[PDB]
Amino acid sequence: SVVKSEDYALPSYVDRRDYPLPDVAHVKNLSASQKALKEKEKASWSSLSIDEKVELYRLKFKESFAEMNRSTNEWKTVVGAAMFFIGFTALLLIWEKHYVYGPIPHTFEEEWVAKQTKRMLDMKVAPIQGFSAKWDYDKNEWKK
Amino acid sequence: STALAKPQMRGLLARRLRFHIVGAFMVSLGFATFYKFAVAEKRKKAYADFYRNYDSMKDFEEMRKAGIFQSAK
Amino acid sequence: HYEEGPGKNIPFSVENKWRLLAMMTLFFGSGFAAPFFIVRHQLLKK
Amino acid sequence: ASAAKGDHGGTGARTWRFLTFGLALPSVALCTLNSWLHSGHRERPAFIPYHHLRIRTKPFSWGDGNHTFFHNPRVNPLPTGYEK
Amino acid sequence: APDFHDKYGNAVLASGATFCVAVWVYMATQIGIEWNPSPVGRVTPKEWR
Amino acid sequence: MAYPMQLGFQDATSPIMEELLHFHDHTLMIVFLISSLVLYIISLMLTTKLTHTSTMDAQEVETIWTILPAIILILIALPSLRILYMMDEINNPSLTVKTMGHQWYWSYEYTDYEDLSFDSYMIPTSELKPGELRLLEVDNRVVLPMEMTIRMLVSSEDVLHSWAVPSLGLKTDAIPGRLNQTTLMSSRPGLYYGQCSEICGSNHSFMPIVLELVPLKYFEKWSASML
Amino acid sequence: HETDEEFDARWVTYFNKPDIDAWELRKGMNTLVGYDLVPEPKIIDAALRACRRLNDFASAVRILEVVKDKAGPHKEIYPYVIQELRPTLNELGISTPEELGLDKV
Amino acid sequence: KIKNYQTAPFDSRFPNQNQTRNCWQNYLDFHRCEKAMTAKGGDVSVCEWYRRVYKSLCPISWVSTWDDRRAEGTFPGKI
Amino acid sequence: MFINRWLFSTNHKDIGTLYLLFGAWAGMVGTALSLLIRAELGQPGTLLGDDQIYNVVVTAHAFVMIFFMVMPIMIGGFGNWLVPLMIGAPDMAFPRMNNMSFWLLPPSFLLLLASSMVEAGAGTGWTVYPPLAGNLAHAGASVDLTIFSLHLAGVSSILGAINFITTIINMKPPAMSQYQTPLFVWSVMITAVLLLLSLPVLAAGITMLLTDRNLNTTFFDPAGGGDPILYQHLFWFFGHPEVYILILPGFGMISHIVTYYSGKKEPFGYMGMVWAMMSIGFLGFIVWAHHMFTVGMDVDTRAYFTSATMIIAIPTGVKVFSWLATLHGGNIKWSPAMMWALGFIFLFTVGGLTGIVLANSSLDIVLHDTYYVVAHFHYVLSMGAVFAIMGGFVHWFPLFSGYTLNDTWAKIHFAIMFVGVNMTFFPQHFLGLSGMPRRYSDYPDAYTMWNTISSMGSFISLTAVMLMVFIIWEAFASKREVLTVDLTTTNLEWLNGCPPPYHTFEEPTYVNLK
Amino acid sequence: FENRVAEKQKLFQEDNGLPVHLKGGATDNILYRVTMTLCLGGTLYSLYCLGWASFPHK
Amino acid sequence: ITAKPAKTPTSPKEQAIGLSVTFLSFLLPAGWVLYHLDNYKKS
Amino acid sequence: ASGGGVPTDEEQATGLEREVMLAARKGQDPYNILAPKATSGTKEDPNLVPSITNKRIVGCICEEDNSTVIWFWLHKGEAQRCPSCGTHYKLVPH
Amino acid sequence: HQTHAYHMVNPSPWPLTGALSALLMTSGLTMWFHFNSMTLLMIGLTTNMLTMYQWWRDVIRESTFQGHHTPAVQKGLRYGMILFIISEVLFFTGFFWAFYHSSLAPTPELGGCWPPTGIHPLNPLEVPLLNTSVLLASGVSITWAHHSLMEGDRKHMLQALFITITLGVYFTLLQASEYYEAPFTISDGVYGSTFFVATGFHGLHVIIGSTFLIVCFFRQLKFHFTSNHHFGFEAAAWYWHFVDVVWLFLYVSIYWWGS
Ligand code: HEA
Ligand code: HEA
Ligand SMILES: CCCCC/C=C/C/C=C/C/C=C\C/C=C\CCCC(=O)O[C@H](COC(=O)CCCCCCCCCCCCCCCCC)COP(=O)(O)OCCN
Ligand SMILES: CCCCCC/C=C\CCCCCCCCCC(=O)O[C@H](COC(=O)CCCCCCCCCCCCCCC)COP(=O)(O)OC[C@@H](O)CO
Ligand SMILES: CCCCCCCCCCO[C@@H]1O[C@H](CO)[C@@H](O[C@H]2O[C@H](CO)[C@@H](O)[C@H](O)[C@H]2O)[C@H](O)[C@H]1O
Ligand code: CUA
Ligand SMILES: [O-][O-]
Ligand SMILES: [Cu+2]
Ligand SMILES: [Mg+2]
Ligand code: NA
Ligand code: NA
Ligand SMILES: [Zn+2]
């Protein structure tokens, strides 16, 4: 039951599916009834009740395989919290845009971009695949 | 009732591995076949087609008439 | 000779979690702040 | 090579002393005499203000900033030539 | 005995998701960020010379 | 030039850049194959409750792990070095142009026949004409004849710079006291842009390169007019 | 290398040692579950009878749990092993984890 | 003899990206040639090829600096 | 008592802890600098000033992350803590010299801070190439302070390397051969050999820069017959081994973490792992000029450096596949440390592969001095070295402190960082291929989208860093004391409890020879 | 000269709990105090020098 | 790993305080500097 | 040629160096310089592990050339077995 | 009480004072180079000397006087010294690399030749040859010293060590005189740069090595060394041979081949 820090060098209990029979029993100290049960265990196990069998298991082991292997809802907390902090990050970015960043250059104004786009087409920027290739020079429109 | 038949009990991990490593390989061949076709061959064809009947002087005249050049009006 | 065990093998105290918070705040916060104040310093020169 | 000497019966103190006084120090004495004969001043090289020499990209941290650390007026011209 | 995840996991997931999507959509579309997307199929070219 | 949301290389303007695109395609296919295989095997290792924790013999499997990567490396190196040696071949240039890097602008010298030289500075953002590209335009472009082998010689008169034109596959460091050579051959007329590619101080970001590729006869008249 | 039959026989002999001690029982089971196999019923039978000689009912139940665990997603293996062990379980009065409610999370 | 000069031809002595020595060698060759032609009272025009080549290859500032140093008597190359 | 213990230490654990604290502080400095870079680039235009202030920030970012965060954490911190424990040694060979390796670092860091405060800072790049770093283009004290900072960091690591090599060779149990030492111990020994050989060449090179700047030497000045390119050779002769120095202790920790959380007693193919690290260490010395493919080297030299660089993929692949084979059949524990290690294996592979792309001198013409290089190295550094550091920190924090972290918090931290680093760096491949140069404070408009996304990624990473600090606070605030640790039979460093006593192995382990 | 190593061995092995750098006696303490004072004072001076050099002097 | 329950449990409220203080220690000084960039750049 | 005047270790070695020297002359290893030779390691013939306290860490190299060492505390009392190979070790304090 | 053979060192202030001395010397050099002041540098050099003196003093106390140098500790120090020497070899390698880079491909600024136009190298058959005979001789005399010590011969050890030191001093004074007499300087381009920096660092190492030998001489005088235990002397002899070998490489490369 109670494990002490200063016991680090002594054989210890573990529940691990790959180490089914740990180095020590889960419970070593036995009450009067638990002593009687361990004596009863020396006789036929058919004479042990279901309750006595479970009690013997629980003296030897802490958790069963089903218990130690159980799934949890932890993923929900992890994913939810991560999304929260990622969300919080966007607040920082909103703050930065409002208080730190000034105007971007005038070259991003709609009319500038329209003219710059035509000039890029006039000089046939990336005419093989990248840019002008996607413009229809015969129909004077973007290719479908 | 009837008895349950004896199942395979040995080498379950190794059998799973053998089966899936093939699937890791058979994918790669399927992707390569696709990637070569979707990106690489498409690029080779794009360049081949562009230049096949490409007229550099006509290209220049269009650029010149659009007014892009310092050296040519 | 020296204190042994959890919370004793370190050059900072963990006896009080709030005093610890203040110290960690000053420690990590000073590290993070320094480049911003060096930038401020360089900008204020010329 | 086997040097040209001999011994090798036992490399001990006596042998290494024998080498110290019988080979090593006589060699030093000989080279010292040789140096003492080729000693005396070599002529001062005529000054040419070659741009790959007498480099000054920053003043030296001593003197007038224009003199090298072991400046020898006789053989080390300044960027402007030999000292007056 | 239900642990933290049993009690609050659903809510942390739902709220975290909703908050994250809402704030990122807002930041991306409502505060004047210039993404500079491709002009292809979007911009009508205009005479420049 | 690059365009918005671009994923890959600028379109090739020279045959060597075309070669580089196809070699990148080849290599990236291999990169995608190996990355995906590793990711898949990772996922496979992690998705079973079945266990085997005793000592596993290693020498059989390590053969595959060494030989297959060795083969893949050879399949990368073969076309890699073919291109390397192609770039180094003798080609016989019709023209030699020099460029000198400066803080913060490029000068150009065309001195095969006449003493033609000029400086090339970024157009300030406030002085861009409508449709011109921020940080990319220059006052005086590097006018060159198209469809001709040109020897470009690159140096610097101060700190390191590097002369780059991505769409021609070009990047040659500009080093004081050194004359570095590259070859330039454009398949097409047009305007081809690049930027200083060595950190060189306060306006490193702001000393671009603009090539203007035109027919020989136009290059000749421009040359004469620039004397 | 040795056959499957020879492997199984070694393990049966291991657990069948009349004076096998507690340490050797644990060593045996902890080593066995490291392998890429669910142990044959005959191996498990021998280990369960070792538990009996060591007056250790709990370890017998735990051994049944390990069998189920080593099968992973192969749900057909454990019920077959239990089927094969039923005469031994009846003889020795060993209740399965399921009969004890120990399969509950 | 071989005019219609376009640019400096490939030179097998200097086949690599570093062309510093090519410029240098041709600069040296020209001035060595013109000195040898003046000493014997001959025609400097036989040296023209070296001049064309170094003019094509050499940065203006290098040539200018080297010319200045020849005039100053500080040119470190042997002519 | 405080001064005796913390300023006069001769104890490997306490010195380890000093290094971890120093490295953590440096990490905060490096993170601030990274955020300043991405703030400048987060929208088109100028935020801070021109390229001088910008590249002072970039330069300092690199030096702090490399010399003050990664090396002190991996080698000084984990090396000092773990190496003596893993070989059952009572301390390091030279416990007093060990303390000077530590105390040289705050003065080194102070000199770096000074460099940025005086004049206009050293806006040179972490490579410090002349003539930009020379006394004309960088007049004044900044670059000299940088040189001196590197000198002190260099001496610190050279003496540390002597200490680790001596300790690892000389202080094992007499029955333990070198082929019975854990992989982390191997990784530190090989790293130490790399430091011993490479740092003195850096020291020679930066000293020559110092004399060019102050004693009128002309090693790198063509006016005196010098050559800027000579500096590059000397720097990179150190600089390539340096990146293997940054990753090797990472490889070592990954081997331990993957083994541990797979429930294995041992890594797959131990001698192959040893072979692979030695091969990588050796090959790391014969490849430096892959940093110089555009300087104008002869073609055959370029062919050799292409080929010798690529060959390193072979031993590295052996390690990657051996980690996968270690996972194989594991009882997988999805601990936060395991998550870091799994992220490492994949993301390091990606960065290693883009390294192989760059090894090709022909393609490197177009990729050199672009963001493609920046993408490559942050995959192996921010998603490699750092992932190994975070994995090791989470794994061994209970050993060092005797307290547990909150696993759920640590998983949340991993998730945030993973998203942040990938959002930061993945788009930089696109920027590189499309031609965005390195060391730019501003970019042509076309590059806006990926720079915007990259900068948003950097802010996510910031949130992860801030959370990490809180997580460490929470552990010390709550004081959950460690009880039992699994697999001590194959993880000796745990066997003396958490934390281990000040003096461990006063009585050495018993190991017989048979 | 005479071999006085035995005397020094006795001195430096005295069971007095002193660390080796102070075990020679009062002169160790003096030299230590001189060393630490110069180091700490010098370090303070270096920081003053940094402060001075951090600002222009036109 | 196994461990004892916390010797000095840190409640959700206490964690919210630690988290907030930690975040503010990073954000406020940097925020102050960045907010005032225009003020520095006009000197 | 050749006088004396140089002390020997016998004359002048002190402290721990001297202890190691004198013990080595007696064929003793109190400071664990040598690797102990294994017994058959059965329960009748266990490896005898000296200690100055009531527990000591054992490392077991189970088979020759194993790279993996198996580590455990050996306590005073009944012999304990390596958890990997079962070889027996028994503590012999002081 | 430990039952291993290794040395747990008393907590010590010398690592901190050494580290601070490094700060003071480097910030001091900066002050000297830029702010026309030698004060910080002088304090740094002083604290460095104090640190080295007290640190190595303590190592002597720990070994000769306290007996902490068991065979295992001594073996560690052997490795330590070897590794240190290796690091020093690599440091010099950087300077040899610089020399060969510049000399094998002389730039146009030099006149495209080595030695450069206007450089008048020293005659390698004159004082440089003398210097060579001197250091080679000192390698012979130090080996005599080692064998005398092993054979228990106090007087001949002292005489041989004195001779070795005298030769180190002779080399140093000869080099100092050659520096003064040289018609070229450190500012005479890359020839002066490589010559003075490479031979200068070597000269510094000769001074360090001579100092180490002198330390050994006084320890010997004080009977510290046994006929079997004398690692300080061994380390100084190894360092001395290193200094000799570096000279031989310098002589062949810079003085002879580079002339
Ligand atoms: C920890 C840091 C680190 C690491 C480990 C590496 C590892 C590698 N690096 Fe990198 N690199 C840097 C940090 C690092 N790098 C930095 C900081 C720079 C820029 C310096 C500067 O200019 O500031 C840089 C620059 C750099 C360049 C220069 C590009 C340029 O400037 O133009 C090159 C080119 O060769 C290169 C290549 C490689 C290669 C081949 C590896 C290899 O070691 C990678 C090997 C790994 C793998 C290949 C993956 C695993 C293998 C398999 C799954 C097997 C199967 C694979 C194949 C068959 C290919 N790197
Ligand atoms: C280890 C090395 C390292 C690391 C981790 C990083 C991390 C980051 N880097 Fe950096 N970078 C370099 C080394 C590194 N960098 C180098 C060498 C250069 C080239 C310099 C030059 O060009 O001269 C460079 C250049 C560089 C550039 C290019 C500048 C330019 O060319 O103009 C950019 C731009 O986005 C960038 C951004 C970032 C970002 C956003 C991060 C973020 O991922 C950082 C986020 C935070 C962390 C990763 C946490 C760090 C702290 C800890 C881990 C402490 C914890 C302590 C314990 C566990 C004890 N970096
Ligand atoms: C017998 C030779 C012994 C050498 C003793 C001389 C004193 C200098 C100190 C020695 C250290 C050596 C290397 C430093 C480099 C420069 C000195 C080279 C040796 C020398 O002394 O060169 C002299 C110039 O010294 C000068 O500039 C003055 C230089 C003085 C300032 C030193 C600069 C400090 C540099 C710091 C070095 C950093 C160390 C890093 C350690 C690596 C860490 C890993 C030559 O004199 P000259 O008049 O030019 O020519 C002769 C003309 N008649
Ligand atoms: C101009 C001045 C500025 C430059 C600063 C350098 C100054 C010069 C200093 C010269 C070095 C003096 C070193 C003295 C060391 C004495 C301590 C010693 O030698 O300690 C010995 C151990 O060796 C040990 O630590 C081995 C100790 C190894 C020391 C290594 C010395 C080299 C350090 C060089 C400094 C690096 C500078 C390089 C420049 C790039 C003690 O053991 P034993 O000898 O076996 O004795 C025990 C027996 O008596 C028992 O019977
Ligand atoms: C790269 C990492 C940085 C990420 C971004 C940080 C997120 C923001 C944190 C908050 O920072 C604060 O912001 C306030 C503005 O919201 C500033 O008040 C400023 O503005 C107020 C009014 O707008 C005035 O009351 C104050 O006087 C004035 O300082 C204040 O100084 C600053 O500390
Ligand atoms: Cu010019 Cu960067
Ligand atoms: O360096 O990669
Ligand atoms: Cu590299
Ligand atoms: Mg570059
Ligand atoms: Na910007
Ligand atoms: Na000896
Ligand atoms: Zn064993």
Residue numbers in the entry:
A (entry chain D): 4 to 147
B (entry chain I): 1 to 73
C (entry chain L): 2 to 47
D (entry chain G): 1 to 84
E (entry chain K): 6 to 54
F (entry chain B): 1 to 227
G (entry chain E): 5 to 109
H (entry chain H): 7 to 85
What does the paper say about this structure?
Owing to the pH sensitivity of the crystallization conditions of bovine heart CcO, all previously solved structures of CcO were determined using crystals formed at pH 5.7. All of the water sites in the Mg-containing water cluster are in almost the same positions as those in the corresponding states at pH 5.7. Following our previous paper, we determined the occupancies of water molecules in the Mg-containing water cluster, and found that the total occupancy of water molecules was 21.15; this number is identical to that of the low-pH crystal within experimental error. Residues 112, 114, 115 and 118 of subunit IV (Q in the PDB definition) interact closely with other molecules in the pH 5.7 crystals, whereas in the pH 7.3 crystals these residues make no contacts closer than 4.0 Å. Residues 93, 94, 95 and 98 of subunit Vb (S in the PDB definition) made intermolecular contacts within 4.0 Å in the pH 5.7 crystals, whereas these residues were disordered in the pH 7.3 crystals.
Cytochrome c oxidase (CcO), the terminal oxidase in cellular respiration, couples O2 reduction to proton pumping. Mammalian CcO is located in the inner mitochondrial membrane and accepts electrons from cytochrome c on the P-side.
